[PDB]
């Protein structure tokens, strides 16, 4: 088992996740993963986005845990590890609001 993340923030709530992502100058696609605040055992993917109405804001996606191991945001794209999920969505949005461009600095 290889043991190894800048983008993982542990027990960080939604509000404090948004404060870190909305730091000045971070692009759309700045992101982090944290424990879910409202579904125990799951994770949350928090991504900086922009639209004309909301301006700079954060979108949150539930990363669900498969009962017997692994992770997904949509059931048709499953991953063994959070690292593999992040690498996948760094390469293509594939339904997310945008790609995972840079871990929250």
């Amino acid at each position: 088992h290889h043991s190894s993340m800048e983008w993982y923030f542990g027990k960080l709530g939604r509000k404090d996740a948004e404060r870190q992502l909305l730091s000045f100058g971070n692009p759309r696609g700045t992101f982090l993963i944290r424990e879910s605040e409202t579904t125990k055992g799951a994770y949350s993917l928090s991504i900086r986005d922009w639209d004309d109405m909301k301006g700079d804001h954060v979108k949150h996606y539930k990363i669900r845990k498969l009962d017997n191991g692994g992770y997904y945001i949509t059931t048709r794209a499953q991953f063994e590890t959070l690292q593999q999920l992040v690498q996948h969505y760094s390469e293509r949005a594939a339904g997310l609001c945008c790609r995972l461009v840079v871990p929250c600095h």
């Binding site: 939604r14 605040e37 409202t38 949350s44 979108k59 949150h60 996606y61 539930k62 945001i73 949509t74 048709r76 794209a77 594939a94 339904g95 997310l96 609001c97």
Partner: peptide
Amino acid sequence: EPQYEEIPIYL
């Protein structure tokens, strides 16, 4: 209960 986004599915 807070808002979470979902990946849209298209047929």
